[PDB]
Amino acid sequence: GRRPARCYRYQKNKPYPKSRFCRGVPDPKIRYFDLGNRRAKVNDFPYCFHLLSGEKEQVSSEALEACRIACNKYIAKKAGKDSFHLRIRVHPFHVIRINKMLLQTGMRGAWGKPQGTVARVSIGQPLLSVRCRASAKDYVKDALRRAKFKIPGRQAIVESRNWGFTEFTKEEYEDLRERGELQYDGNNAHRISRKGPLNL
Amino acid sequence: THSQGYRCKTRYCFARKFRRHGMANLTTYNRVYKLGQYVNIKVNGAYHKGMPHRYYNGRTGTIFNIGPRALGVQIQKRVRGRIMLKRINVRLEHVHPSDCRKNHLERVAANDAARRLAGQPVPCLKRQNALPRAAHVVSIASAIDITPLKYDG
Amino acid sequence: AKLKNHTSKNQNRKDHRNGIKKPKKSAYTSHKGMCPKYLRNLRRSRANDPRQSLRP
RNA sequence: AGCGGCCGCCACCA
RNA sequence: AGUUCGGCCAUCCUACGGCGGAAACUCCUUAACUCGUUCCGAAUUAAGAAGAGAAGCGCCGUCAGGCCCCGCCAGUACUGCGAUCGGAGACGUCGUGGGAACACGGGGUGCCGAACC
RNA sequence: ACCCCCCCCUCCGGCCCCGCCGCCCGCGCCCCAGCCCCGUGCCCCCUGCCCGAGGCGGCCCCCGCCCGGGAGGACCACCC
RNA sequence: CCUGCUACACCGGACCGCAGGCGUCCCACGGCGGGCUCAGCGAGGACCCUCCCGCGGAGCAGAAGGGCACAAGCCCGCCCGACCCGCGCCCCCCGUGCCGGCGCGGGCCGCGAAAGCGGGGCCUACCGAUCCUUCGCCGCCCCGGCCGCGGGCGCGGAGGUGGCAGAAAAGUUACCACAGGGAUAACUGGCUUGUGGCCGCCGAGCGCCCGCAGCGACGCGGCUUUUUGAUCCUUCGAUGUCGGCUCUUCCUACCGUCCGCGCGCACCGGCGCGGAAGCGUCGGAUUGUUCACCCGUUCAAGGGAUCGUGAGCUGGGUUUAGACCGUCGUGAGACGGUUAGUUUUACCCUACUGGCCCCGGGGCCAGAGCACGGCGGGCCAGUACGGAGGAACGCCCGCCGCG
RNA sequence: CGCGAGGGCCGCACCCGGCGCUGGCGCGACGUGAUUUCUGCCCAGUGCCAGACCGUCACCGUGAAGCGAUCCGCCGAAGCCCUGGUAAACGGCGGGAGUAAUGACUCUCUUAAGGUAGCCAAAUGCCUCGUCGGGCAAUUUCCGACGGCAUGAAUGGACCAACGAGGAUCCCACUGUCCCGAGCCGCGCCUCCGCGAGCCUCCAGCCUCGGGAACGGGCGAGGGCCGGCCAGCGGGGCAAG
RNA sequence: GCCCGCCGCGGUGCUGACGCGCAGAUCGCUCGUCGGAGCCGGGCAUGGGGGCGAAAGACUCAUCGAACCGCCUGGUAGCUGGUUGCCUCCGAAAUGUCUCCCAGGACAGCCGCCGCCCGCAGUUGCGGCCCGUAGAGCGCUGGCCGGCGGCCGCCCCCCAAACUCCGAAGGGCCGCGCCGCCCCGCCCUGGCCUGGGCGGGGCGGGCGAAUGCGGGCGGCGCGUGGGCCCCUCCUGGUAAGCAGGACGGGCGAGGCGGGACGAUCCGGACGCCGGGCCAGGGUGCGCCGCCGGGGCCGGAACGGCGUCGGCCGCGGCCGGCCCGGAAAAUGGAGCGCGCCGGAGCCCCGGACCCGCGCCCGGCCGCCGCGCGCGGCGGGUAGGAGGCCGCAGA
Ligand SMILES: [K+]
Ligand SMILES: [K+]
Ligand SMILES: [K+]
Ligand SMILES: [K+]
Ligand SMILES: [K+]
Ligand SMILES: [K+]
Ligand SMILES: [K+]
Ligand SMILES: [K+]
Ligand SMILES: [K+]
Ligand SMILES: [K+]
Ligand SMILES: [K+]
Ligand SMILES: [K+]
Ligand SMILES: [K+]
Ligand SMILES: [K+]
Ligand SMILES: [K+]
Ligand SMILES: [K+]
Ligand SMILES: [K+]
Ligand SMILES: [K+]
Ligand SMILES: [K+]
Ligand SMILES: [K+]
Ligand SMILES: [K+]
Ligand SMILES: [K+]
Ligand SMILES: [K+]
Ligand SMILES: [K+]
Ligand SMILES: [K+]
Ligand SMILES: [K+]
Ligand SMILES: [K+]
Ligand SMILES: [K+]
Ligand SMILES: [K+]
Ligand SMILES: [K+]
Ligand SMILES: [K+]
Ligand SMILES: [K+]
Ligand SMILES: [K+]
Ligand SMILES: [K+]
Ligand SMILES: [K+]
Ligand SMILES: [K+]
Ligand SMILES: [K+]
Ligand SMILES: [K+]
Ligand SMILES: [K+]
Ligand SMILES: [K+]
Ligand SMILES: [K+]
Ligand SMILES: [K+]
Ligand SMILES: [K+]
Ligand SMILES: [K+]
Ligand SMILES: [K+]
Ligand SMILES: [K+]
Ligand SMILES: [K+]
Ligand SMILES: [K+]
Ligand SMILES: [K+]
Ligand SMILES: [K+]
Ligand SMILES: [K+]
Ligand SMILES: [K+]
Ligand SMILES: [K+]
Ligand SMILES: [K+]
Ligand SMILES: [K+]
Ligand SMILES: [K+]
Ligand SMILES: [K+]
Ligand SMILES: [K+]
Ligand SMILES: [K+]
Ligand SMILES: [K+]
Ligand SMILES: [K+]
Ligand SMILES: [K+]
Ligand SMILES: [K+]
Ligand SMILES: [Mg+2]
Ligand SMILES: [Mg+2]
Ligand SMILES: [Mg+2]
Ligand SMILES: [Mg+2]
Ligand SMILES: [Mg+2]
Ligand SMILES: [Mg+2]
Ligand SMILES: [Mg+2]
Ligand SMILES: [Mg+2]
Ligand SMILES: [Mg+2]
Ligand SMILES: [Mg+2]
Ligand SMILES: [Mg+2]
Ligand SMILES: [Mg+2]
Ligand SMILES: [Mg+2]
Ligand SMILES: [Mg+2]
Ligand SMILES: [Mg+2]
Ligand SMILES: [Mg+2]
Ligand SMILES: [Mg+2]
Ligand SMILES: [Mg+2]
Ligand SMILES: [Mg+2]
Ligand SMILES: [Mg+2]
Ligand SMILES: [Mg+2]
Ligand SMILES: [Mg+2]
Ligand SMILES: [Mg+2]
Ligand SMILES: [Mg+2]
Ligand SMILES: [Mg+2]
Ligand SMILES: [Mg+2]
Ligand SMILES: [Mg+2]
Ligand SMILES: [Mg+2]
Ligand SMILES: [Mg+2]
Ligand SMILES: [Mg+2]
Ligand SMILES: [Mg+2]
Ligand SMILES: [Mg+2]
Ligand SMILES: [Mg+2]
Ligand SMILES: [Mg+2]
Ligand SMILES: [Mg+2]
Ligand SMILES: [Mg+2]
């Protein structure tokens, strides 16, 4: 029911989203983008890992769903369902067309019908991210390895200096918490206000 | 193209500038114009009478007629191997006085002024395209020592 | 059969071969299109100037 | 466009 | 300092607290006449001087929102010209020119012109 | 290793030996090692430029059919 | 004809490119002046009313984009610039026409205290030559004169050409044509590889247990040109266009036989992998068939060579002219089935197969050619192995195919 | 189906002709195609026909007006229109829902009428090598049944003894069709004496790969090769016509 | 209008012979019919859009879905073929608009020739105005994952050809010599003693970026209106040696060397010679030309305790060059032979080989010239000048 994925690998067309001009698009395969334990506080999971793209290409939503299930299932075995939070970074927003052979007209009136969706990714862009505690730190790179075999091309697995899905480094974050100057949201941490009406 | 009406392809050039909508200020009507003057054409998109075609936006011409309500402007226009002198009639909201010869009148006034002053020898009044620098000394008592840095990734 | 529809490939080179011409010097001063009420007063003024008048 | 009472019959150089 | 008429149209706007008034502007008092309100003297038109700094207006304030300037962001993103440079390609590199934005941190918060008191 | 190469087997330019019975041409020999390489890292360098035996290696030349039969056969050829 | 995008910041820029629109509608839905402020949130009020804030989030005939707040929107008053006479420019563009717009000189008007504004409906689309006909001014001519009818002419509108720079126009040919075209289809070949076919990588799972003996979802990466498409480069003064028969040679992506390893391999029999293209892969029933489907045997792989092979054949199919049926057509006729229908020429050149251009007897060998596979029986042995069943190295004896 | 002669059908430039030396048991125009057994429903459409003068529909003629040209009225043949008839004229001849695995049954929308008697995967059935049965070791063929892409009644339906250089399947007998080929005869071929042409021809005539108008005898690179001829042969010369 | 069968009359099958024939339809065997709607001979009748037809569009003297003969007629063709001596000077287009236009034309462009007349630029610099693309972003019109706190507020992952508050590179248009100061004359516009336009005088001045270089106007006319390729930038399509657009360049219409081989790639653009220098590519032998020095030893995902070199702490990540992944049909191609501490790959340095391409010298022709000499030379379609040869007056 699908062409082999080599038929839509590279970014050759201008982006073509579903809109009031494009209609009849089938539903993508991936619909959950935040798995694991997303409601855990910012202070719980200080470790973060990524899977950076090594190519400028297109990833299908069928492949995004395969890589989500591979990674998630592996960690939920070695470490339990609540030691990690896994986020899929890229979203499938681009529509690919097909000019369907069967009377048969060939290249006359060859503008094709919607057939699928793909995500448009660039060099060094993250595709998956994980934040976890220390009890899972050993097995995250094993689950990222699983996902890599579902994605076309060359991918790189790296460990970040940031604190979780926050924006400070661990040493930076530690000190800011050490003196007080750092705000807390739910699972994200910000800085002192220092602007606007004093209190009331 | 496949469709070529008078105001085709005008979605951005005829639109107003951000927070610059509404009526034109009244300097548009208190300026004095004279025969032979240079002007710029810029279309104001809120005034629809005597509004020139999009080709003429951003050109510079010369006044040939002073009418009761509109001005007559001459534009040199290239057509496929020759230049044509075109004449158009445009209302005041689309014309502004041009400074294309402003620099030349300042210099002509400045050369006759600096001649009157004579500095007993007359100074050189030709414009000079920037020359190579002359010889000079510079101190190196306090000198900084830089070098390439290591890759960080 | 089908043939080519359009190109401008060689046209800027043909446009340049004889130079880009310029309009006649006298087109810049043509009276065509000037106000008639200005062109009437222009004739009247000269006809009554002995230095300019050309009446016999 | 023409007679008759939407129907008939008949007309026809930008 | 004030009023009438203007230029440029927020460094002038919006919100909330204040402080002021000799003169000036305002609020304010009136329904005979003038003229007026899909009904209404609210508005507006006419006629006035008992009362006011409560408003509008002028001034001051605020880790105020906006707006305006500078620095950083950054010789980074991108790009003109040249290459028998690399790579299966997708893309990147070097030589020679041009060069951002967002974000971020500090500063600021109408002036010019005619006539009259 | 049913594969591949050689033998056996089919064709076969050329050549050699033997039967019958002359010409011409050239002048130069250790071997074996390269992480023993046994004392090296040379000689030759005039094919006429003044060279021109014997031995040792080369070269040339040398051999009918017709006719009739057949185990042979289009014609020829082949075997007698 | 028109809007936005394609289009890569002057202008310009292609496609049977993308999302759409137009052949109308309105004496007010028009002109002018004055007044007013919209959509709505919030908060109130017997079972629409009020205040407050309100950059337009409303409205402006109908596509889309742009424009507009004491207004270009709404309401009221008075009106007909939705006029007459004469010129010029802009867009498209050859700087020709047409649609559409804009700027002026002179008449006559509308509204307004006045300055002003007004040649429709805010701007970008909403439309039409010559000849003829018809109507409206103010005049001139009817040529030998004059008068009355009538006819013609100078100017301007209307009646229409949408295939919109504007002929007056139905089919069929299987009875056939002519000039040409590889500028252009039906068949080989070429580029491509979606589709077909073949091969990897990962490891959710299955497999009593046990992811990898054998398997392997979701996904991802390739190769091939034995399918079918896509395209139109070569061939239309012609490359004979299906299959079968006959005959030869080649590929390996290997079905049986050979040699090694592995097993969820006791034996027997199966299965998986590597090397290997020498030999073998057959006889028939129905079909033109390639394909398929059954019966039988020593149990039976897949392909290429101009979809190998028509001056080698055959001519069943398809594929002229006769004829029949069904559906369709007013008709001549058209298209799923059916039957009858001429297969021409080598003596040239090369290739190939043999043969020749007279030269003793016996030999040697450079080059070239090439050929022994497969299936059984007896003994081993009813033994090893394990109850039922049931092998092997070796030697010897036959058969089949080929030579 | 038309016509009783003063007619009908046809010829023909004109005058004049054929059927006709004829007369309804005749002449002319069409369809079906011996016999046997049959030939159902529809006149709304198209075609044809006869009976009525409603509307329309010519010139001529006639009235009113005009200087006259002319303008407007009235009059009104056939035809059409209207009223009927006609299918062995052309042609046409059904949907949905339930109801004892079927549906006698019922309600329903509908036509000018809704295919009757019969026949059938037919020389007419797409699906399709239909299903079942016969026959064979084995049958996309054949025969017999069953019931419709798109069977069917002088578009003639069904059946038929005799007849056919007509299209099919099977059996006995017969055989070189074949397994699988072998031997022989005459005449050509072949050699010789005599005689003696046609077609065709840029120039030439050995291969492999590359590139190239994408399949070369010639061009780039490699591998072969004295030269001259015969009997045969059909791979190539994109052989000839 | 019965059956077997001879002559006769016909023509079934062999898809036999022949098929450069015996023959522009024949021959062999086999076969239909043979008392009848049977076969044969002579005379006579019907004539071309007509005849005649047991009906095949058959036959009408080898001619028939309209005979033959002469003329109209050398019928018309936007279509195929051909179109005849030399040298010299110049030199294109395959595009816009309209067309019963789409294999054709007219008008414009491009080019030639003939002229005639008295500053300039396909460039940089300096100055003034214009644009909404790449990038960036989520305020606007839309789209989209989640987390905290009381429908609402703060954070947050990810987006747009028909979103844009910001905004390049890059382009585009205009200007760069005559100015000042007082007066005087003429006539629509103003309250006026106002303005504005066109002219006259008297005065002071004065050549105000770089670089190169002579410029402008007309007449008459032809060929062309199928293009294609490269580099960058794009659109449809799985893709294509596919189809459609853009600035600049090329082939067309460009010789020579090199890329083994090719219309277009790398160099270089051309009269006839002699000498020199050398671009691009290369330098074991074919085949003109090489040495020295430092290292190493077609194709995807994915694997490698092959070898050499790194970075971060036995381990983990990498780089160079190699190995596996890597299957086609006649015998065959890193050009061949061959090489492999090279005759291979990367880098450094000194040479060498040769395109009349550049330099110097001579000669030819053309265009110029202080008349001393100087610069130049390709060419399809097309145009112009000077001549060679033929027959006759
Ligand atoms: K991967
Ligand atoms: K233009
Ligand atoms: K106050
Ligand atoms: K062999
Ligand atoms: K042997
Ligand atoms: K033009
Ligand atoms: K228009
Ligand atoms: K006017
Ligand atoms: K007309
Ligand atoms: K008229
Ligand atoms: K022809
Ligand atoms: K053609
Ligand atoms: K062609
Ligand atoms: K072509
Ligand atoms: K391929
Ligand atoms: K073709
Ligand atoms: K083709
Ligand atoms: K052809
Ligand atoms: K040919
Ligand atoms: K095998
Ligand atoms: K026959
Ligand atoms: K045997
Ligand atoms: K045998
Ligand atoms: K045998
Ligand atoms: K009948
Ligand atoms: K009959
Ligand atoms: K009957
Ligand atoms: K009827
Ligand atoms: K009837
Ligand atoms: K009827
Ligand atoms: K029936
Ligand atoms: K049957
Ligand atoms: K029927
Ligand atoms: K009988
Ligand atoms: K018969
Ligand atoms: K018969
Ligand atoms: K028969
Ligand atoms: K024989
Ligand atoms: K090739
Ligand atoms: K070839
Ligand atoms: K050839
Ligand atoms: K060939
Ligand atoms: K007979
Ligand atoms: K024979
Ligand atoms: K015969
Ligand atoms: K008989
Ligand atoms: K006749
Ligand atoms: K005829
Ligand atoms: K004739
Ligand atoms: K003739
Ligand atoms: K004649
Ligand atoms: K013609
Ligand atoms: K023709
Ligand atoms: K010809
Ligand atoms: K036509
Ligand atoms: K054309
Ligand atoms: K044509
Ligand atoms: K022309
Ligand atoms: K947004
Ligand atoms: K496609
Ligand atoms: K050129
Ligand atoms: K390595
Ligand atoms: K080669
Ligand atoms: Mg695309
Ligand atoms: Mg020019
Ligand atoms: Mg308008
Ligand atoms: Mg037209
Ligand atoms: Mg026929
Ligand atoms: Mg072609
Ligand atoms: Mg494929
Ligand atoms: Mg073609
Ligand atoms: Mg042929
Ligand atoms: Mg052939
Ligand atoms: Mg074939
Ligand atoms: Mg052949
Ligand atoms: Mg043949
Ligand atoms: Mg036929
Ligand atoms: Mg041998
Ligand atoms: Mg019949
Ligand atoms: Mg009947
Ligand atoms: Mg029938
Ligand atoms: Mg035998
Ligand atoms: Mg040839
Ligand atoms: Mg050669
Ligand atoms: Mg041959
Ligand atoms: Mg008989
Ligand atoms: Mg008989
Ligand atoms: Mg025959
Ligand atoms: Mg003729
Ligand atoms: Mg002729
Ligand atoms: Mg030239
Ligand atoms: Mg063209
Ligand atoms: Mg026309
Ligand atoms: Mg026309
Ligand atoms: Mg092409
Ligand atoms: Mg050409
Ligand atoms: Mg060469
Ligand atoms: Mg050499
Ligand atoms: Mg020349």
Side-chain angles (χ1 to χ4, degrees), chain A residues 1-101 103-170 172-184 186-191 193-200, chain B residues 1-115 117-153, chain C:
Chain A
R2 289 184 55 237
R3 282 172 161 165
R6 62 177 169 258
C7 288
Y8 304 98
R9 187 165 167 197
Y10 297 112
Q11 307 193 359
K12 287 170 73 179
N13 293 332
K14 289 179 182 96
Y16 182 57
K18 147 166 81 163
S19 73
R20 72 167 171 291
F21 309 104
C22 181
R23 292 133 56 186
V25 182
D27 44 293
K29 184 173 256 186
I30 174 181
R31 286 166 178 202
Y32 315 118
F33 302 78
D34 275 334
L35 303 313
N37 181 34
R38 52 190 188 193
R39 300 192 303 127
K41 256 154 293 176
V42 54
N43 215 83
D44 293 48
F45 295 166
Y47 304 113
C48 189
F49 298 83
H50 294 308
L51 178 83
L52 304 188
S53 175
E55 316 238 345
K56 179 206 191 63
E57 52 166 26
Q58 308 181 323
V59 180
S60 56
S61 66
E62 288 87 350
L64 284 176
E65 180 72 329
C67 82
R68 173 191 75 86
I69 300 183
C71 193
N72 192 343
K73 180 170 301 307
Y74 186 91
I75 330 176
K77 210 165 333 209
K78 296 295 195 152
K81 204 190 148 293
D82 43 306
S83 282
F84 72 102
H85 171 195
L86 150 80
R87 168 173 288 159
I88 308 280
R89 292 291 285 275
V90 294
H91 295 66
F93 286 145
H94 175 73
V95 182
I96 53 160
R97 293 182 303 269
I98 178 156
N99 169 34
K100 198 79 198 177
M101 291 303 118
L103 182 71
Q104 182 182 23
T105 57
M107 295 320 294
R108 161 181 280 171
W111 164 265
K113 291 313 220 278
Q115 183 227 348
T117 28
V118 294
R120 282 159 83 91
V121 309
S122 56
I123 291 276
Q125 182 173 348
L127 308 193
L128 331 170
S129 295
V130 177
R131 76 180 177 118
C132 65
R133 68 167 89 110
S135 189
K137 189 189 65 55
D138 297 351
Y139 321 84
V140 297
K141 280 194 186 178
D142 322 7
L144 288 178
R145 168 186 219 272
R146 302 272 161 119
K148 178 169 65 72
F149 285 90
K150 305 297 173 43
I151 303 295
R154 305 198 45 76
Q155 293 78 34
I157 304 179
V158 78
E159 191 173 355
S160 177
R161 313 259 298 196
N162 266 321
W163 188 288
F165 297 155
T166 325
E167 313 101 335
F168 320 91
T169 78
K170 295 177 162 58
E172 252 196 320
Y173 173 101
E174 290 266 39
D175 182 279
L176 278 190
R177 189 170 50 76
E178 193 183 345
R179 308 168 315 157
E181 288 172 13
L182 154 116
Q183 166 136 343
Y184 299 90
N187 65 345
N188 207 34
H190 294 281
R191 267 169 35 79
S193 78
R194 226 55 99 222
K195 255 165 39 177
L198 202 101
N199 301 101
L200 200 151
Chain B
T1 295
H2 96 267
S3 173
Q4 211 161 351
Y6 202 88
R7 278 187 49 172
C8 64
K9 295 171 177 67
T10 47
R11 179 170 173 171
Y12 298 114
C13 56
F14 282 18
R16 319 285 264 120
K17 302 295 146 45
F18 189 56
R19 297 185 298 119
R20 296 267 166 252
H21 296 244
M23 48 146 172
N25 65 12
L26 287 188
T27 315
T28 339
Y29 312 101
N30 284 314
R31 297 199 256 266
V32 204
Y33 287 102
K34 289 220 162 70
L35 289 186
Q37 179 165 348
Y38 283 86
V39 290
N40 311 307
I41 309 289
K42 310 191 233 170
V43 171
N44 183 326
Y47 290 85
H48 301 144
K49 268 157 164 41
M51 179 166 70
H53 190 263
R54 168 179 55 96
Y55 175 89
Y56 296 101
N57 189 73
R59 315 279 175 182
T60 303
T62 283
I63 303 195
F64 74 90
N65 188 51
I66 302 266
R69 222 148 62 151
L71 297 182
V73 182
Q74 308 189 96
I75 300 296
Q76 307 172 15
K77 172 179 185 184
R78 171 180 173 212
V79 173
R80 203 78 177 65
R82 75 199 175 280
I83 306 285
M84 296 184 126
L85 197 67
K86 303 281 253 158
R87 287 188 172 182
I88 56 175
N89 302 301
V90 37
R91 305 271 288 259
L92 289 182
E93 292 83 359
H94 319 280
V95 238
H96 306 73
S98 170
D99 290 356
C100 60
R101 317 184 87 237
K102 175 186 184 185
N103 178 79
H104 179 69
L105 300 168
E106 297 191 57
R107 286 188 64 252
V108 156
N111 300 349
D112 305 46
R115 261 189 167 81
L117 183 131
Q120 274 56 55
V122 167
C124 202
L125 290 170
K126 271 199 285 290
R127 272 176 300 177
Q128 192 60 30
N129 296 316
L131 293 147
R133 327 164 184 112
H136 53 80
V137 296
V138 53
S139 169
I140 62 193
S142 174
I144 322 299
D145 318 321
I146 54 181
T147 28
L149 286 162
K150 65 182 290 188
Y151 178 79
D152 300 310
Chain C
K2 305 163 77 175
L3 297 171
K4 197 164 170 63
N5 300 283
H6 169 66
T7 181
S8 57
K9 147 136 295 141
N10 193 40
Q11 305 309 310
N12 200 27
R13 209 210 289 263
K14 282 162 78 204
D15 286 337
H16 273 277
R17 246 186 281 179
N18 288 306
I20 301 283
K21 298 293 168 279
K22 317 181 143 276
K24 269 173 199 81
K25 298 300 283 200
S26 54
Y28 288 85
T29 50
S30 167
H31 278 332
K32 208 186 187 194
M34 302 179 76
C35 184
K37 206 157 154 278
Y38 175 74
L39 295 173
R40 290 162 201 167
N41 199 68
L42 183 51
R43 306 189 306 255
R44 253 87 107 165
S45 95
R46 292 175 155 171
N48 310 272
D49 197 337
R51 207 71 139 91
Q52 303 191 243
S53 160
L54 244 77
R55 309 164 171 183

